[PDB]
Amino acid sequence: MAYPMQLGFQDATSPIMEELLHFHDHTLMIVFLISSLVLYIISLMLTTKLTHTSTMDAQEVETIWTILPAIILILIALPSLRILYMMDEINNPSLTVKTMGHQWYWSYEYTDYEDLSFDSYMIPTSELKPGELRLLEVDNRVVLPMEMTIRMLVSSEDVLHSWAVPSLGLKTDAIPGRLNQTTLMSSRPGLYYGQCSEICGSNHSFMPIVLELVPLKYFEKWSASML
């Protein structure tokens, strides 16, 4: 989850999110350098009483300021696309979980073996247990085995929603009639939170996602107890 006064990304829960962090650091350095260079040159152009108002030939300097931006764009795009195709690489999941968006809650189906499904609603603020997080807790968490490649399949039974978990770098739209696939792998146990990310009406702000990552044997016994 996010913490107060946070400036950047949530800490990475998955290897792909760690990659995204390092790629973002690379790209932000470039953003800062260009924005600062433009601000500095503005100030340089504006701080002399010396003048030169006759016609200035352009074509020499336009080679510099197309070629150097093209090179910069290539230096962004190369690691960008590497991560894109690494994301897409074949992973061989050992579990498939479906989630269906609804106004305004998520349901989950774990039907590889048994018919397990349940609904997951926000805990109202007036019913939070002491120290629980306003607008983020759910009654029934998405319990998942840690350290395992999981295929999530995302759809909706009404309007569009979008299933997101920032610290895992996940956001997959939930579209009726469509079954969208994403892969999930947590390096750690714990609780990982997300929020519906496609406006879906009055309570779009209030249908969150809570993943609970535990060892396989606990997941197996939880699954059996949820039938």
Binding site: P93, T96, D112, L153, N180, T182
Partner: peptide
């Protein structure tokens, strides 16, 4: 020893409707 449905090269993309 079925765990889950394996990768199927007929349906390699994000939309898995047709696989179902």
């Amino acid at each position: 020893n079925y765990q889950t449905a394996p990768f199927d090269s007929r349906f390699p993309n994000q939309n898995q409707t047709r696989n179902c």
